[PDB]
């Protein structure tokens, strides 16, 4: 499923991402935009044999288990296939745990490169929330 910017912004607010651990809602929409282009079924195979899954490209080496990644840890205690749903519940749950680590949202490389230090609120502007 490919979300529209405002559609995801509204769903993410509904999933309590607005102001979760000091991050404004715009950070999450921008992040999803640059991590997966709002595509919930997006996947990317990495060099280390790990795969990033879902709307928020969650890594199979540290966060979810896809049964195919070497030094896997499954920090989110969930199967990677659960982050490929049109339902963003599992992806949001895991992302919240990821961000609760000291590195915060810096775990999302695309977010780092394209959102951090940018006017992130613009991503929820012009939306019926």
């Amino acid at each position, epitope marked *: 499923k490919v979300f529209g910017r405002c559609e995801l912004a509204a769903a993410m607010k509904r*999933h*309590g991402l607005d*102001n979760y651990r*000091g991050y404004s809602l715009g950070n999450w929409v921008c992040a999803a935009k640059f991590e997966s282009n709002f595509n919930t079924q997006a996947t990317n195979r990495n060099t280390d044999g790990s795969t990033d899954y879902g709307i928020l490209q969650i890594n199979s080496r*540290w966060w979810c288990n896809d049964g195919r990644t070497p030094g896997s840890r499954n*920090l989110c205690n969930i199967p990677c296939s659960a982050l490929l749903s049109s339902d963003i519940t599992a992806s949001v749950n895991c992302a919240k745990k990821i961000v609760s*680590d*000291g590195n915060g949202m810096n775990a999302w490389v695309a977010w780092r490169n394209r959102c951090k230090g940018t006017d992130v609120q613009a991503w929820i502007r012009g939306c019926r929330l």
Partner: antibody
Amino acid sequence: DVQLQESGPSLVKPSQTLSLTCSVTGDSITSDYWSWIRKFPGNRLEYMGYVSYSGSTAYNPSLKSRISITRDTSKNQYYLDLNSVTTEDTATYYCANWDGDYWGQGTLVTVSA
Amino acid sequence: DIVLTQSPATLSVTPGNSVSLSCRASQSIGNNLHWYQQKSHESPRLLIKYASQSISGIPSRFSGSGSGTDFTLSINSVETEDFGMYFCQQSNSWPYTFGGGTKLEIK
């Protein structure tokens, strides 16, 4: 499956340092976030803090920085150090993972002169 | 610090009836509100995750709802094993905080 268990002194004196160890059986401590929660004599629960997989920590400001949460990969345990305790720190301490799915049995620690 | 207020402090019910426990946040926390059950000489047990997400291994009679600052924990048809303490907790902002708790007793 995973199981947690608190251990350490149950009686300590004022101004000393209270230390508890949480032993984790079933999986590596490096595969989760770990925390410490305590219950005061009046059903008052307080989230003390947690240590992330990275070793980064979050401490409740209410502890005025007397708390320290560390871990030992080799022994597969994580600890809690609470400095300069007072009768105010008399409570039932529990260790549980960040998600709160796994909890220990809880151990009462009385601070007394 | 986000403050959680639970009402009522105590609730008396007859096994078989239904009850709803309230928890209000001094500030909005979206859906980041969790419910715990605690019985004497026992550590807390997670009943509901993020306002309304159910937990594997927990009776179906437990359900939660609400968002923002107003949340509720419902128990459709109370059972004897359901008597004990119930606490809500928010993870939206550090430090995580718990509500004072609501005690559920047999009528």
